[PDB]
Symmetry: D2
Subunit: 345 residues, 4 copies
């Protein structure tokens, strides 16, 4: 089968021919219908050998949807042909976090050698993929696969970040979204669907600000040195109830600390090595909590799928073939994909 793999440290991913896998006991083989590209893939591929934890070769793609092609021995609860999304942050299934579906916060995965598809286990950017267990599949019914694939991370990750502090986001609240890319453009829509927060979007790119307004942002303002003052002009001196930073550079985290309200929240979602919030007296308002969330929970993925099925998420995509996978990663690097890149085999 055709797949897109990261095969040597510091090189671009390549299109390869590798054997179509067969599911072992408990596993499910999917025919992949759509595979999302994520900026985390760039970050992973830019790591030096010592830090890179994905293994070589690695079939990329931690955003996967497909149709059930073959059931491994003993698998129940799915039929051949069922359209499913892959829950990505695989955990042990048995610990206190996993028992609540919070496998993203599994305390045993490292020790048991459990890794996600697309970063340690083979991903979705291939004609077929293996899923380890039935509990990592969520039905999508007749959802369009191209717009569904990003739900598994571009949808799930913002959804989880927002869910952590949803009770803060009542009528009269303001949520700032920094970075209107794959994640951020979905985050805006989640905020509008599950809260009455006023949503202020921030991006470097005027076309991404237009995208933000297109998907329901109440205001959209230019990132950089003037952003904090511009946001405060919109909120008045109270600042923003919550800031969801999908960039996570030091400059954006600094903007977040400069605008967050007393008893508010900053969610540092974007990943930029070395960047950090400075949480101390006189450096942040009283009661303003800060967290780096990771991916999301099983029940959250179901809720994301439910939002999509209800028409609440307009996922902006561009479609690529498997052969175009490496070119698509170049596009993502240069910032020329308006929303999410999606590979269709």
């Amino acid at each position: 089968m055709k797949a897109v793999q990261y095969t040597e440290i510091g090189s671009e991913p390549v299109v390869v021919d590798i054997p179509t896998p067969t599911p072992g006991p408990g596993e499910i083989l999917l025919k992949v219908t759509a595979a999302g590209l994520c900026h985390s893939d760039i970050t992973v591929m830019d790591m030096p050998a010592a830090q890179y934890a994905g293994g070589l070769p690695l079939t990329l793609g931690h955003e996967g949807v497909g149709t059930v092609a073959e059931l491994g021995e003993g698998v129940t609860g799915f039929g051949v042909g069922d359209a499913v999304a892959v829950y990505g942050p695989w955990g042990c299934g048995a610990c206190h976090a996993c028992a609540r579906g919070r496998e993203n916060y599994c305390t045993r995965a490292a020790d048991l050698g459990i890794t996600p598809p697309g970063y340690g286990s083979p991903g979705s950017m291939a004609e077929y993929m293996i899923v380890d267990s039935a509990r990592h599949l969520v039905p999508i019914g007749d959802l369009d696969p191209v717009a569904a694939a990003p739900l598994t991370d571009a949808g799930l990750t913002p959804y989880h970040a927002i869910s952590r502090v949803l009770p803060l986001l009542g009528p009269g609240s303001t949520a700032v979204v920094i970075g209107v890319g794959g994640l951020g453009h979905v985050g805006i829509q989640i905020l509008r669907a599950v809260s009455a927060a006023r949503v202020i979007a921030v991006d470097l790119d005027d076309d991404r600000l237009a995208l933000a307004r297109e998907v329901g942002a109440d205001a959209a303002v230019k990132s950089g040195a003037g952003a904090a003052d511009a946001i405060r002009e919109l909120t008045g001196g109270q600042g923003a109830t919550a800031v969801f930073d999908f960039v996570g550079a030091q400059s954006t985290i600094d903007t977040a600390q400069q605008v967050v309200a007393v008893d508010g929240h900053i969610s540092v979602v974007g990943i930029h090595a070395g960047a950090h919030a400075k949480v101390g007296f006189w450096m942040i308002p009283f009661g303003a909590s800060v967290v780096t969330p990771y991916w999301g929970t099983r029940s959250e993925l179901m809720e994301v799928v439910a939002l999509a099925r209800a028409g609440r998420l307009d996922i902006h995509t561009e479609t690529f073939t498997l052969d175009e996978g490496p070119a698509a990663y170049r596009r993502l690097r240069e910032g020329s994909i308006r929303g999410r890149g999606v590979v269709v085999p």
Copy 2:
């Protein structure tokens, strides 16, 4: 009347004679029965002129209990003689936070010039004190005033910090308390009363570790370079569900980050200028939230008083006269008050 005041930048507080105040409309005059000393008072008195926001002179004391001596015009809901605790973080009373009793997070207090007793308004370390409004008084009934005064901050502040994340502290959880002083020794007891968390106390001083065990800590660890590893040996690799850092020095915050669990919490309660948690990828576990809480809410103070009335809080105190106030602050500076210093006016 006699009072203890901070009167010039960089000097020790002094005992003074100033007029007994009269309550204006809406105000209440208390005869003070006990006034707590807090380490925040030291921090405030060590600020340079440019930063110090308390005004001069300032009657110290933001931990106050008393008896109602006189009602100002129009005051209802209290009688002369009623024993009350002073809710300290005064807010506007009208904004969304204040409407929920969360006057500690009032968004209008700065703009309206509203300051707390003992830091901008006259405090409790005097024979009498003024309280601005009835909503800032909570009844204590027959609670001993000496042990009640610290409930207003040494109790309220840890209680609020813990309350922010109480749902995390289920059976099987671990809570670390760093700094077993005024706040910390009460924090341990709150954790034991309102949660099933295992409590690990951390202090530099072996006698404070003994105090921690005396008030119900399950384990006690020496602070410093070995603390993080020692805590992890106790929690077995998952780390601590929550860390309540009542010191807030860089070293203690670093210990906190090195032990906190995935999807846990660090509450930076202690105040050390410049110190901060570094919240970023690879610097803290996934999902481990960090906050600097401030004081507490109206309903939280009521709950702290309810814990005291139910026998759940053994408040360790040492009593001083008003004349001993300055000496008591020297004791607090050198770290020789085992628990909370409390001034009792006579």
Copy 3:
């Protein structure tokens, strides 16, 4: 001044001339800009002498907005001319519930003789009204008074009922709204604004089902014997996550129990004496909680006002003069007001 009063048991309310009140200490006099009629007023006026708790005479109207006309002694947190909404369920201000703004659940109001405007204290259906304290006023800025008056109960009550279980109403949930009147037509809009629930409206009257669709209901079902089956056809067998019953008749409560999901909720908001949910094994699904909520909280009223100011609430009203007050109550009795009746004094 002109006012509409209930003056004798079993009679219709009458238009009267009574003195314009002057505010005492702590009170505020409002020039009323709009006064809502509520079905609870009908229920109150239909009570026999032994049950009726409003006092006689009683100026009706527990839905009030106005402009500050005169400040009582000591009141300084509002200016003359400020547009304000009246928080209705007055409490003591001092108990644990009141400290959280939850004066609707005040434990001391009965004992202290504290009653709401429009049911024991003089209401808003008059040229002017007295408000007891500043904490019972919420600013509305430039909101149209006619559409603002219903926010104080038609908005607040559903808002509180929904807020009690808002975490249940995630994507994929269904909320049923029974009764698309004053409260129900606002409840539909609150659900759409603060949740991703699919909303199914239920009414006896086709025109009210049309109103429901006009304000954002996803589906509309005829009430009565076929309603439970019709709702289940829409929800596909799991039933409805939450049912907000703004009628509260036995038939509607029965429908609610027949459609509610496992681990769901029924809020019995409508008041029909004798009607009740039967919460027992084999009579309701496992985990499906039931409550009779009452009015709402201070912070909730602020949130309702914020929804209105953000354009999220299209309040359907019909305007009446004070002279038309009694006629308007006849209209409400016969069910011919499409949304909320609102009296505008001139």
Copy 4:
């Protein structure tokens, strides 16, 4: 192997010899170390043929602990010899409730024919038992099996009921426990461990009131007509924040409604066919929610085990052999087991 089975409608259970089962793919065979008797077993055995849903024959016992004896094909995460407790309310594992571990509220179990061990699937009152999947086993380490078996229901069910409203049970709250039997005597201890509620126990039997005080109840009062007034004398006129009714007879539910506080909770846990709370205006206080909870969640069972391992639960038991199983059910019927009956297979 030896087992205790319900074999014909209206008869007592009997000791039988049936084949020792072999685990199929995904299943686990346990050597049973302890099997709890529950009053639900009596209720089930007293159902007429038309209602009884357990199937015949049925190996009784929905409270099970054991050691892993044999792993079915493909089973990972447990080793032979591991001591485990059986999570009882088996669900589909895939729905939104099950994904959160809340298999007690599974929406698909009925349709898929999934039933619990001891009521549709073979139970724990046998030398060996099958568990359907690894996710239905929780490790207990070196906990004594006799005291561990009741954790799976006598512990789990009260724990879940309490957990639904734990945020209500702050300092100053009161929780009433009605019925100090298997469930109730554990419920008292859970309340003391995870909350600061004052606990008032209620039972018909003076020896069970003594048991209540032995396990940490603050007061213990006689059930029946005088109970509501007696409880109110202890709480003052505010009533009880929460009432956990482990009897669920009409008389006990009525007591619960007569004592519950405004904005409180009644959990109807005990099962008595036909009995129900009457939730309507004038029949219950404003804001007092009522629910019939069912069993508990996966993560809750882990938390119950954690309480036991921390020494917070003193489980009162009496031990029986398999041959004594039928005699033990007679004892439970007559009310002569002080706590939980537990069968230990040899």
